[PDB]
Design an enzyme around this catalytic site. Sequence first.
Site, PDB file in Angstrom:
ATOM      1  N   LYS D 159       0.829  -1.200   0.000  1.00  0.00           N
ATOM      2  CA  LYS D 159       0.000   0.000   0.000  1.00  0.00           C
ATOM      3  C   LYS D 159       0.865   1.253   0.000  1.00  0.00           C
ATOM      4  N   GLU D 185      -3.739   7.908  12.489  1.00  0.00           N
ATOM      5  CA  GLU D 185      -2.573   7.223  11.960  1.00  0.00           C
ATOM      6  C   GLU D 185      -1.678   6.779  13.105  1.00  0.00           C
ATOM      7  N   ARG D 186      -1.295   5.506  13.085  1.00  0.00           N
ATOM      8  CA  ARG D 186      -0.384   4.996  14.097  1.00  0.00           C
ATOM      9  C   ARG D 186       0.883   5.835  14.078  1.00  0.00           C
TER      10      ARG D 186
END
Lengths: 47, 514, 49, 464, 464
Positions: D159, D185-186
């Site tokens: 991705k 978002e991590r």
Amino acid sequence: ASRRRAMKSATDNADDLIKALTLAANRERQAQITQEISEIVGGANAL
Amino acid sequence: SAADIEGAIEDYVSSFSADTEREEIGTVIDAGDGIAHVEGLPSVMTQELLEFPGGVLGVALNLDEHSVGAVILGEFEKIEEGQQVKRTGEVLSVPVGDAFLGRVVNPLGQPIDGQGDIAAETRRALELQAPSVVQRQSVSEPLQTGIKAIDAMTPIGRGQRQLIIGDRKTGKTAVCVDTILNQREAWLTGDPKQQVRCVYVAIGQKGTTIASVKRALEEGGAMEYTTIVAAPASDAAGFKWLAPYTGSAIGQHWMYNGKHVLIVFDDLSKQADAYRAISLLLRRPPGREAFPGDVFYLHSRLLERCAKLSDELGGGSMTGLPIIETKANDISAFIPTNVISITDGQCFLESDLFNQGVRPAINVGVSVSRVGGAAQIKAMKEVAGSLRLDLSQYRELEAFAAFASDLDAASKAQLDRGARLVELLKQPQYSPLAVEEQVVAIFLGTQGHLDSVPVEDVQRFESELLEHVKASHSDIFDGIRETKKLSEEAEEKLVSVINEFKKGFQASDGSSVV
Amino acid sequence: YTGSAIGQHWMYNGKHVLIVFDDLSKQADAYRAISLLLRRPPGREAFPG
Amino acid sequence: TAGRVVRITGPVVDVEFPRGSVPELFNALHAEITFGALAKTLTLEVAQHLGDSLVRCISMQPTDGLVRGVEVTDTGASISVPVGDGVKGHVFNALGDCLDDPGYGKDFEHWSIHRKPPAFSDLEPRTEMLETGLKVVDLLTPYVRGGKIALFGGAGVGKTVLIQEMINRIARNFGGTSVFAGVGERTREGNDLWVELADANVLKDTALVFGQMDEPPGTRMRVALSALTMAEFFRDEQGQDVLLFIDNIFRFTQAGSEVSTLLGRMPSAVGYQPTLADEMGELQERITSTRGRSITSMQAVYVPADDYTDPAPATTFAHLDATTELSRAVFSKGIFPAVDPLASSSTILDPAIVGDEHYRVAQEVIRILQRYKDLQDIIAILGIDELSEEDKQLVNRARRIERFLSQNMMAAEQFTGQPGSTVPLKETIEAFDKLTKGEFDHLPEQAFFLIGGLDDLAKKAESL
Amino acid sequence: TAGRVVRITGPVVDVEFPRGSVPELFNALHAEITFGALAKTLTLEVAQHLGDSLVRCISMQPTDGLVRGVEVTDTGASISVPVGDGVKGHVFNALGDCLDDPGYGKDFEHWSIHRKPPAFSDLEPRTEMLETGLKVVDLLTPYVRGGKIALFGGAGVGKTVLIQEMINRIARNFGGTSVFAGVGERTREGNDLWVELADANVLKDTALVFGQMDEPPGTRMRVALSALTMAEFFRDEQGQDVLLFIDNIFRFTQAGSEVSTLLGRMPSAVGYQPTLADEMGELQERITSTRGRSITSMQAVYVPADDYTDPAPATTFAHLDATTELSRAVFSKGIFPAVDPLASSSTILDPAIVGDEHYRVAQEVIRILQRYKDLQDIIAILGIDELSEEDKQLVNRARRIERFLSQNMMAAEQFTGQPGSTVPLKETIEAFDKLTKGEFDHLPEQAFFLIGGLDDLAKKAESL
Ligand SMILES: Nc1ncnc2c1ncn2[C@@H]1O[C@H](COP(=O)(O)OP(=O)(O)OP(=O)(O)O)[C@@H](O)[C@H]1O
Ligand SMILES: Nc1ncnc2c1ncn2[C@@H]1O[C@H](COP(=O)(O)OP(=O)(O)OP(=O)(O)O)[C@@H](O)[C@H]1O
Ligand SMILES: [Mg+2]
Ligand SMILES: [Mg+2]
């Protein structure tokens, strides 16, 4: 040959049944979430 | 040229009135999530259009003892506490008139297409009572949707509520836009008794989708008679809630004046969602699927104003074509079943068929026109009366055939007939067919003349045969048009031309279809 | 959070730490209880937002 | 003129203001936490007007340490994000404060994150293909210029490589820019993406906006809008085609749900906010083409419980125009960009918009690959020899068709060194027309791997 | 003296009276709406007392344009509906105002629509059978003359078609009078029924009362009682045998739920009103017959979302002598009238009331169909071929029985053209005895659809 055809039909019917049961299960899951939230928020509204 | 420019402004200046009258001004004490509470306004009417200072408007739903609860329509981000709120002396209402033809107007009638203001004849209250039982007559004249499937199997009659319903990306807006476009032949007649005006209420549709529908209407000349009430997905819940009501008001003004209207609502499921938002933000307890108990009242109040009035009230009509976006073909869900209970028949557009290549994806058996048949020209009824049951039986039999080694000769014949009829009904987009063409095309298949044609070529055989007739034996089309019956003389002529063509027709395999 | 604090002191000092939590569903239930006793509005499965 | 904090209930903070100074909705207010360990300048977004000159706000930062009666100063403008050429090559949070260089961008032009979509008259009435130059996308999943593309993915399916490839192509083919909005978002994956883009040398053409998961629901809800504001500036001021990534949009929906729960709104549907569709429209409808410049968007959509009937995906998918799914099956076979030809789809792929020839070739490719997938079970269980002559021919053709949908992606230049390939659309159509007719079935399978176009196919085959 | 409107919440209006003039529950109040476009004399029905001399009222006409502070004059009596032989052959609304000619019925005897159900001492269970001529009803769900009948269905199953079918079967030759109550159904259906009865010359013996969907919850819940008052006047004052059709009774409970959520009563299980059982009972209990005076009743029931466990159908089941549960599955098979043979039941299906042969045949049919339902799983996956031979024969004759229960109803003519057929009870019993014993296991299944009779069965079998 008849076994090949019959089991192809059986696999197709099983796949269609799995799809229908997954749709029903998802709708029941959503219904359970909605009903639970309704109970919780009704309890809240009555304090 | 400059004379008109000067004269209009001169008339505005001279007509200006020093109108010093009495406005009841109240003050906002609370506002949040599209709901504003306004204290004061002691003589406010329930469902009055309050006018907030930012130009935005609100509808006074709850009139408590302390304050007025107003559902704000549009940019509620401008509202704040302390703002003056002025009455407008009008119950929830929208301007109506012929000036709206060819205009894209937000749910309150304010134009958004960029053209000038709209010369509204009068205002109509969005919540007027629908015609009573004694003010209607059974729909007796057709609304040719231009789709072979709809106009043959499940016809729409003027004054009918036909519920287009199906999953996302399944051909619903296409059917509605096709039925709007097909009315140009009637519009050009200039006869109000035959002209069909249109109103396309987009609820929660993307801006680009409304722009594309407007372009499709313009390219087909349909904006001479089609209004667009655009409540795009960007607008707040209030606009999405009352967009169908303003469309119904625009349509009703014409319906009560003796004209015919076609109201499309795309999608009423997005109205139900917006009303869910408004009701829950008002803390009204939810019901099934988190909807309020009166969502059925919303949709029925809406669609019950689509009626075929009696001759004593102008004989007008308003045909509704609500679009309902089912979820994974759940026709048994709450909102779909509601709108089915309100409407007079559903065209179910199955997604499996839409992906399979059958477009429009009309699901036979589940699709039905309750008050159909009566509103269907005699030729179409004689040629297609049995088509729906035959197609449903073919669909039931295809499952058996998909796995059977061999079948009865009768079953083989029915399978073939269905496999040719489904190909015959299939239709390209934005390609409506006049009623004469539809009846001839359906006649080709129902009377068996396609049984000699291979399936893959049926589309061409019909498609070209209508061309062959169109300028070789136009007597057939004119006979259907004038008489509206498939007279035996015309039928003999039609079979003669069909055979004359079939002799000269060549299939994809090179074989003759004789 | 007490475990995360004890771990973070070693983490920022250059050591490597490994924190296990048997089980975070029981922290979530505890926080749900505290929130509901404080009248904080409940969402799905009664949990605070 | 400055207010006081009167209630602190976790992220929610209530602020009292004098009689005629109440801030407008969605205004950004500043509060101070002065405790030594947690000193902060909190940003509070006014969410509701409660009356008596009280405003209920959702803090964009943790409220741990806030004190009742602390002064709250009103900025008078909504959450402002920096916009300019300077946001290219930097990573920002939903409040516009830079993360890799703090204090940066404070002198830039600032734009409110809340702004209307293009007026109706300015929308483009016709959908136009965005010729990505990737064979697989341009053939089977044609992206709509100014549309939204579902980007399903996972671990190792590439991705991030596809994201780098699209940044590269939009920055070298269309002369545009990319903005990445890390909605929830991590922090680990955020750092990984930042370093990977810095190493790929595409960060200079990308503006990163992260609403980190550790941040309260307010920032996770507003980061999408901040990134889209940066994109809207690149569109409506600098005249650049823009590409907005959003990972993950379902976390925008979830943040909205959480904020709705906090403010006391009754949950709806399946527990989501009553205004779900309204918020989704306010976000997506700003992603559109207007005045010839477009913000295309690629959005990673997490479908909860693998249910597409769930309200979150069922409201996202009303706006998505194309779907790109990356699968381990395709990836492990060396076929990059990893796009699954069968699961993926596009709404523009109808003969009305694309050419009739394009539709025919795409449908034929789908048919061949679908038959190959049907036969793969027999291949794996009984061996390839079990096939008939027609089936063997079709399998051989499908192998080369699926391997030809691979491409030496521009993002791979940093690894292999060889420059990327931009196949013209009609060139791809002709190549796959030839390949579905078997004209290249005599070539070995390894020839088609990672080959950018038709001429490159021959020039690589001669090496075999 | 007159009151004063103090707050309005949709169709619910609170009115404050002088200390000594509070009106009784269910008293009719008159308010005024003066805004010209929709000015009207607004009828309200007192539903609660709130203290401080306030009374909370439901609105019969839509409360649009109503203004706080307008006068409200109590009429001293509950909503009254006209009664007499005059109401036969006319269309009335929920408030007793005639529609076919407005000035009608204002000089007739007026009865209060709120009255207690007949005392228990006067009730006795009716058990005489009502031969309708339909195979499914006359065999498996024999209707009870003088008793309550129901037709449960989702949307699009055939409730109204079967209601008008029974209007043709029963009312068309009935010696007494009839009443039809449109409770929240289509106005189009109302007009169609009115014209159909006029053409069938049944109108002169029917009193029509309509509360159709376009009306607020007030009339949509009081229209049933308005019709039921004329029905009870015919039952008691005239002694005539009465029919009472009610389409659709679930709209009564739905209007109840709306008015409940407006009056402030807390939500029940699935959002319905807490008084669902009581509100339904005080209506149904009035529809019962008494000793020497019969009132047959036939109620369409809408089972929302096809969920037969919803509280409204789940409550209205206990009030019925004969229940005919129409189902989607039977509908999609094309087996009209779409009666699920198993779910439907009748209290007179007792060998002492219908006879030994009738009950024996009905029970054998039910056994065959129940075994078919139990085999449905294997039928769905594997197919009939993999069953045991006894089960195979049972499934074959189960399919034949299930199709044979279909019938070409008279009301179906408009939808199909094929005219309607009535099969006398004896022929139904004999035919189903033959089917169960296996005498017709050789004819094809298709020979039993919509045929209605043994002679027609033979003719259609020869045709195939
Ligand atoms: N009859 C048809 N033949 C061929 N293509 C069609 C037909 N009808 C629609 N399409 C195509 O199908 C796609 C979706 O069509 P459409 O927008 O009408 O569907 P929909 O289900 O109403 O969509 P939505 O839910 O997004 O409004 C478009 O490519 C349209 O061109
Ligand atoms: N016996 C029949 N023969 C042919 N078509 C039928 C038959 N019964 C029903 N239908 C079709 O099904 C439609 C269902 O009509 P009906 O009014 O009974 O539906 P309903 O959804 O149960 O009603 P309501 O709107 O009152 O809840 C009929 O209009 C007709 O289209
Ligand atoms: Mg559409
Ligand atoms: Mg009905």
